[PDB]
Each structure stands twice: as structure tokens, then as C-alpha cells.
């Protein structure tokens, strides 16, 4: 086996299928960055750093030697544990389709939110600068009148075009802003229809972030380097519960500062 030790968990083959399915579709619903950034191929459990190609001046060993350290961005391992009832697990083989997989969904929601927050807002403890912090383009404020959202999106798009950034432009909206765009109608005309005619890409439901982002999906600007994609591992168990976890090893890198425009509410 591997570091997950899945074979040691008292989980039926039938239960494993439902647990993995629920975690997969729950993670896919809350995640919204893997739809605009470049997600790499899993490098394996041995992957630990991503070369940034830069040099770091360091003290020479002796005179006549010019020493530099090779810079690298480290990978962080995210592990969201959850506990399942062994009665709910054993019910699956007996034909139960209403087994309580809420711990699985909450762990998937937590891991998905941590990942998107790391991509867009940052993770300073892991030396991961967010897209919002690295965006060299002028940040914008979401209007108080939701019928003026097309105005701020249009100016964000022009900021990308004026920065030489091309590619299909996409707009990521927070849970509140997405719901407002879906319901708001200016004199009956839905403002989301206005936005769909303004965005050649997609309008993505991004519940983990706050505010909004207008970026390009041309590729090569936002890099989600995966070492190990999200998987379910086993920790411990007793006669009543099993402690599992969702694990992931990754890093994020932002190569183009002008490729995004951040938006926030008025504070």
C-alpha cells in the first residue's frame, strides 16, 4: 500500500465508491480556480518544490567563487480529516443510499475553499501570494447598485486589454455577487445576459472567494502545480467510527501580474 493506508480502513468496497463519488462532486461544485488556472499533472508523492528559475546571492565558499542558491517554491500538504460512523459505512453494502456522508462533504467544502483562497487570496505561511495581491492592474470596487455591475466589469476588461493581455476572459464571482447578478434586472433586462455578451469565456461560481475577479484563461499565467491531487486516506478507527481525510499536495504560482483584475465591496 501507500501512505494513505486505505487497505487498513474498515470500509467496504461499496462504501468506498460512494465516499469517493461524494467527495469528488462536492469538491467540484465548490471549486472555481481549477476552471481558470493551469492545473498541472500530478508529479507524484516525491514532488516537493517548483523551480522558479531565479538565483539567490549567498556567501562565497572561498575567494574567486561566485555562489548563488537556486530558488524554488515549496509544496504544501493540505489534510482535512473527517470522521464517519461505521454504522453508516456498513449500511451501504446492505443497500442504504441515505448514508450520512456529511463529514465527507464538509471536508470537501473545506479543502476546496482553502485551495481557492490560497489561489486568489494567498497563503503567506506557504509563501503563496494570492492573485489579488499580485494583480498589478488597478483594483475596482463593486457598485452599490447591482445594475451597475456591467460597468465595473467593462472597465476591468479594458484594463486587461490595455495591458496587452489576450485570451478568453473569464469572470469569477463570489457567492453573494453571483446570486445578485443572476437575480438583478435593469428595467427587466437581466444583467447576467448583459455580462454573458461581455464575457467570451465563462462566469464562474466561486463561493470560496469574496468580491470578484476578471482574468484571462489564455494559459501560462496562473499555475496550480499538483504533486498529489485530492485523495482519501485512512488515519485510525475504533468499533464505532473511522477517521479518514482528504489530502492534497500543491502550490500556486502567478507569472503574469497584469493578467487579472481584482474587485471588492466598498468597505
Amino acid at each position: 500500500m501507500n501512505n494513505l493506508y486505505r487497505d487498513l480502513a474498515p470500509v467496504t468496497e461499496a462504501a468506498w465508491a460512494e465516499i469517493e463519488l461524494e467527495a469528488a462532486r462536492t469538491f467540484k461544485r465548490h471549486i472555481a480556480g481549477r476552471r481558470v488556472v493551469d492545473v498541472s499533472d500530478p508529479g507524484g508523492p516525491v514532488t516537493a518544490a517548483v523551480s522558479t528559475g531565479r538565483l539567490i546571492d549567498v556567501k562565497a565558499p572561498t575567494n574567486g567563487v561566485i555562489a548563488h542558491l537556486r530558488a524554488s517554491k515549496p509544496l504544501v500538504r493540505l489534510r482535512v480529516p473527517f470522521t464517519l460512523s461505521r454504522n453508516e459505512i456498513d449500511d451501504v453494502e446492505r443497500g442504504s443510499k441515505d448514508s450520512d456522508w456529511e463529514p465527507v462533504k464538509e471536508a470537501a467544502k473545506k479543502l476546496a475553499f482553502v485551495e481557492d483562497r490560497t489561489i486568489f487570496e494567498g497563503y503567506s505561511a506557504a509563501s503563496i501570494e494570492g492573485i489579488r495581491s499580485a494583480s498589478s492592474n488597478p483594483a475596482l470596487t463593486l457598485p452599490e447598485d447591482p445594475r451597475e455591475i456591467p460597468d465595473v466589469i467593462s472597465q476591468a476588461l479594458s484594463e486587461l486589454r490595455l495591458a496587452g493581455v489576450d485570451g478568453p476572459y473569464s469572470v469569477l464571482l463570489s457567492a453573494d455577487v453571483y446570486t445578485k447578478v443572476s437575480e438583478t434586472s435593469d428595467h427587466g433586462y437581466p444583467i447576467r445576459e448583459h455580462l454573458n455578451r461581455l464575457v467570451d469565456g465563462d462566469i464562474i461560481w466561486a463561493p470560496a472567494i469574496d468580491g470578484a475577479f476578471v482574468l484571462t484563461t489564455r494559459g501560462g499565467d496562473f499555475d496550480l502545480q499538483l504533486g498529489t491531487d485530492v485523495a482519501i486516506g485512512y488515519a485510525s478507527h475504533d468499533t464505532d467510527t473511522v477517521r479518514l481525510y482528504l489530502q492534497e499536495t500543491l502550490t500556486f504560482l502567478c507569472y503574469t501580474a497584469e493578467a487579472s483584475v481584482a474587485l471588492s465591496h466598498k468597505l
Partner: peptide
């Protein structure tokens, strides 16, 4: 099921 376990989400 009882193996590796990468849900294979990847690029969506």
C-alpha cells in the same frame, strides 16, 4: 476503492 484514491479532479 481500497487503492491509491486520487479522485482525479484535475482541470475542470
Amino acid at each position: 476503492t481500497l487503492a491509491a484514491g486520487s479522485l482525479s479532479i484535475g482541470s475542470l
